[PDB]
Each structure stands twice: as C-alpha cells, then as structure tokens.
Symmetry: C3
Subunit: 121 residues, 3 copies
C-alpha cells in the first residue's frame, strides 16, 4: 500500500537555477515533513510544471540530491486562465501504511495560495 504526497512551489523566473533550487527545497521538505528515512521508501515521483516553465527538468534537480535510483517522470500542467504562474508540482508515491490523514502535503512560497485548506489554526 501506497500513499501519495503532494507538494508545490513557485519560482520567480524560468531559469534552471531557479527551477532546480525550488525543486530540491520542495523535495527535501516533503520527505522531512513525513519522517521519511530513505529514498527506498519512494515507489516513484511524478512532477508537473506549468507551461511558463521550460528551461529545466525537475528530475535533473532530483538527481542533484541523489534520486538516481528513484523512478522519476515529468509532465506539463493544464494552463487554466488566472491560475498561479510558474509552479512546480510534485506527486511522490510513498510505500507506507501511514493513514491518509497523517500524510503531510507541502505547499511553499506562493503555492500556498493553491490550497488554503492546508492552512490551519
């Protein structure tokens, strides 16, 4: 049994340096938030990028933090009018028996605006 973990983060520019940094930061925070101890717990990680980000592969950033042995895939997000620009989204598939309500999803920088429900009191 598997639990997905969602993440999202924004960048201010379509450059590799920006995209790679943001992706590394988000991945590490997703793992930390969930108490993951090894990349071996990850079945796979899927990324999406908005259409305004073409300069870099998020999987390259994941390999900068050593995710060579984690299977990675990336795709393009739907360009909805008025939706948040320059977003990197992550779906990590985690081999765990953690209950669904104990999985922690991580939305950073302006991406917090995507999920106001995940703000809490």
């Amino acid at each position: 049994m598997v639990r997905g973990i969602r993440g999202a983060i924004t960048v201010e520019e379509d450059t590799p340096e920006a995209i790679h940094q943001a992706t590394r930061e988000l991945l590490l925070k997703m793992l930390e938030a969930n108490g993951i101890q090894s990349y071996e717990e990850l079945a796979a990680v899927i990324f999406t990028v908005t259409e305004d980000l073409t300069s870099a592969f998020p999987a390259e950033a994941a390999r900068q933090i050593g995710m060579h042995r984690v299977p990675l895939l990336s795709a393009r997000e739907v360009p909805v009018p008025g939706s948040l620009p320059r977003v990197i989204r992550v779906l990590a598939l985690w081999n765990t028996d953690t209950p669904q309500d104990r999985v922690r999803h991580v939305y950073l920088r302006e991406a917090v605006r995507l999920r106001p429900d995940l703000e809490s009191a």
Copy 2:
C-alpha cells in the same frame, strides 16, 4: 499492492461548469463500479485533459466532492490527429488486492468510443 482504475468522459464545451460536472460524475461512478467504501483506499488520482480543455482543473472538481485528503495531479494529453475531442481521463491508484480482471474501468458519454473492448455482450 495497488491497482489502477481508468476512467474517461467527454464534455461538449470548454467551460468550468461542464468540466467540473463531468469530473464529479466520472469519479463517483469509478468508485461505485469498484465497490470502494472510503477515499482512504485511494493512494492518489491522476487526471489528464485534452489540449482543447483549458478552462478548469479536474482536481478542483474532485475537491467539490471532498477529495482534499486524496493526493491529486493533472497533466495534458497527447493531441493525436483524429482523436476524440474534449476528454477528461482519470487514473485512480487504488490500494486493494482485487485481481486485475475484477477492476472495473469506466468510460462515459462519447469516451466509450476509446475502448470498444470494454463493451460487452
């Protein structure tokens, strides 16, 4: 162990009202067809939309039926010439030991044309 569940549905127009309704209908029918009792059985749900649908996020529709705690991701489908227009596709990842041939895939409206094998006698 995990089983994917596929769904697909068409809409007649690229509007949020159409996309959201179709997505809600399809998701509920996928769950019902498979005898799912809780959203907690879902590892994650991945959506795709054809390039002729940009007005809405399918994940927003999933949140209208309460999928806040289900990890969701969306992407764009390949624009193959002559392929069916205005299709919302769903891949639900289901934590189950159901055999592969007992999983029920759900193709609604004109999307039945995608999978004539799933028509039966």
Copy 3:
C-alpha cells in the same frame, strides 16, 4: 508496495509505425529486464511523449501487445531547450517487493544519452 520502472526510447520520425514499434519494444524489454511473469504484476503504466511526437498514442501500442487490462495513461513531456528529441518515456508501477537497487531501468537507442549513470563498467 510498489516499485516504479523507468524506460525511454527514441524514434527517427513522428509516425504511428515508428512510435508504436518503439513502444512495444521498450515495454517488452522493461518486463524482461525485471523478470516480470505476468501483466497482472503491473498496477498501471504511465507514458510521456515529447512535443515533437503527436501522431500516435503509446497506449495503443501497449494494447497491440495485449495491455487492455493494464491501466494506461499518457501525457506530454516538458520541452526543455537542447533536450533529446522524439522520446517516448515509460513509468511502469510494479507490484513487487524487489529492492530499489535491484529494479532495472531501460534506456534504448539515443535515450541512453539521458542517463549516463546507467551505463556501467
């Protein structure tokens, strides 16, 4: 518990005959490399294609080798400048307890250039 299996292959032209052949070849090699004995071991398979490939659905090729009962989904890859053209990527989600370092990822034709780490001595 699930392990992803990555594959990738290139084609020389955007035609169905080329895309379908390459997809069939890659899928079978991914299964063989990992000692998979039944399609029932596959939770789902996700494909991506680069933006320069629109003539065919990789899932149609998977159905030419009988993957009707395997849930399939396809999406478009990020068009990064200078990245390899005409690539079909595969993420197979495999129900297995195989350790992460014993899963075999398969990169064929020019797609070997994507992952020089997977060349070995």
